[PDB]
């Protein structure tokens, strides 16, 4: 048995309610990331980024 | 048994309710990412990005 | 047994309700990504991107 | 047994309701991606992109 | 047994209801992708893109 | 204007997916009702029943 | 204006996904009601029953 | 203006996902009601019952 | 203006995910009600019951 | 203005996730009510009961 029955990068059983009035975004020459939910990633090699923002 | 029965990059059982009035976005010369939900990725090699924004 | 019975990059059992009035987007010289839901990817080699925006 | 019975890049059991009044998009010299749902991809080699937007 | 009984790039059991009044798109010199649903792809070699928009 | 422009007993915009393996029913001396979907009724006078089961 | 523009007994915008393996029912001398979905009724006079079961 | 523009007994914007393995029911001399979803009723006069079970 | 623009007995914007293995019911000489969701009723006169069970 | 713009017996914006293994019910000569969710009722006259169980 090697690397077996493992759970990795798993999201389960999440319930979300959002109520908003007049949500707004306004970006000039910029990076904006908003609202990421319930995201799971596994990367055997290399670099993994969730919700990452870089300007210029 | 090698690498067997593993669960990796899995999202399950997520319930979402969103109520909004007048949601708006406005981008000039910019990268905007919004609303990602329930996304799962696995990458054996290389780099995996979820909801990542770069300007210019 | 090698690499068998594994679940990878899988999304299941997601229920979403969205109510909006006057949703708007307005982009000049820009990349906008919005509303991604329930997306799963696996990449044996190379780089996999979900909901990723680059300007210029 | 090698690489057998595996589930990879699979999306199942997703129910979505969307109600909108006056949804709008307006793009000049720009890339906009909106509304991706229930999309699954596997790539043995090379790079796979879901909902990815590049300007210019 | 090699590469047998595997499920890859599969989407199943998705139910969608959309109600909209006055949906609009307006693009000048731009790429817009909207409304992709229930799409599955597998690529043994090369790069596979779902819902990807590039301007100019 | 009396009783005008009213909407009553109306069902609209419903999408259903059902997947089953080996569904079964077995009734002796009994009433069974199963699977009613998308049914609308209006009755000006008298009693209206949807999916109602009585034994003996 | 009397009783005008009213909405009564209306169901709209419902999306349902059901996955089952080996669903079963077994009734002796009994009333069973199962699976009612998306049903709307209005009754000006008298009694209206949805999904109601009586034995003997 | 009397009784106008009212909304009564209305269900809207509901999304449901159910996953089950081996669901079962077994009734002897009994009333069972199960699974009612998204049901709306209005009754000007008399008594209205949703999902109501009586034995004998 | 009398009784106008009122909202009564209305359910909206509800998202539900259920995962079960081996759900079971077993009733002898009894009334069982299970799983009611998203049900709305209005009754001008008389008595209205949702999910109500009486034995014998 | 009398009885106008009132909201009464209204349920909105509820998101629920349930995960269960081996849920069971077993009733002899009894009334059981289980799982009521998101139910709204208004009754101008008479008595309204939600999720109410009486034996014998």
Curated annotation (Swiss-Prot), chains A, B, C, D, E, F, G, H, I, J:
Cu cation binds at residue 12. One of its GO terms (molecular function) is transcription cis-regulatory region binding. It is found in: Cytoplasm; Membrane; Nucleus; Synapse. Highly expressed in presynaptic terminals in the central nervous system. Expressed principally in brain. Its main location: cytoplasm. GO terms for biological process: adult locomotory behavior; amyloid fibril formation; behavioral response to cocaine; cellular response to copper ion; cellular response to epinephrine stimulus; cellular response to fibroblast growth factor stimulus; cellular response to oxidative stress; chemical synaptic transmission. GO terms for cellular component: actin cytoskeleton; axon; axon terminus; cell cortex; cytoplasm; cytosol; extracellular region; extracellular space. Keywords: Acetylation, Alzheimer disease, Amyloid, Cell projection, Copper, Cytoplasm, Disease variant, Membrane, Metal-binding, Neurodegeneration, Nucleus, Parkinson disease, Parkinsonism, Phosphoprotein, Repeat, Secreted, Synapse, Ubl conjugation. The keyword Ribosomal protein does not apply. Residues 1-29 are annotated as: 4 X 11 AA tandem repeats of [EGS]-K-T-K-[EQ]-[GQ]-V-X(4). The modification Phosphoserine is found at residue 49. Sequence repeats lie at residues 4-18, 19-29. Changing residue 8 to K: In PARK1 and DLB; significant increase in binding to negatively charged phospholipid liposomes; increases oligomerization. Soluble monomer. Homotetramer. A dynamic intracellular population of tetramers and monomers coexists normally and the tetramer plays an essential role in maintaining homeostasis. Interacts with UCHL1. Interacts with phospholipase D and histones. Interacts (via N-terminus) with synphilin-1/SNCAIP; this interaction promotes formation of SNCA inclusions in the cytoplasm. Interacts with CALM1. Interacts with STXBP1; this interaction controls SNCA self-replicating aggregation. Interacts with SNARE components VAMP2 and SNAP25; these interactions allows SNARE complex assembly and integrity. Neuronal protein that plays several roles in synaptic activity such as regulation of synaptic vesicle trafficking and subsequent neurotransmitter release. Participates as a monomer in synaptic vesicle exocytosis by enhancing vesicle priming, fusion and dilation of exocytotic fusion pores. Mechanistically, acts by increasing local Ca(2+) release from microdomains which is essential for the enhancement of ATP-induced exocytosis. Belongs to the synuclein family. The 'non A-beta component of Alzheimer disease amyloid plaque' domain (NAC domain) is involved in fibrils formation. The middle hydrophobic region forms the core of the filaments. The C-terminus may regulate aggregation and determine the diameter of the filaments. This is Alpha-synuclein.
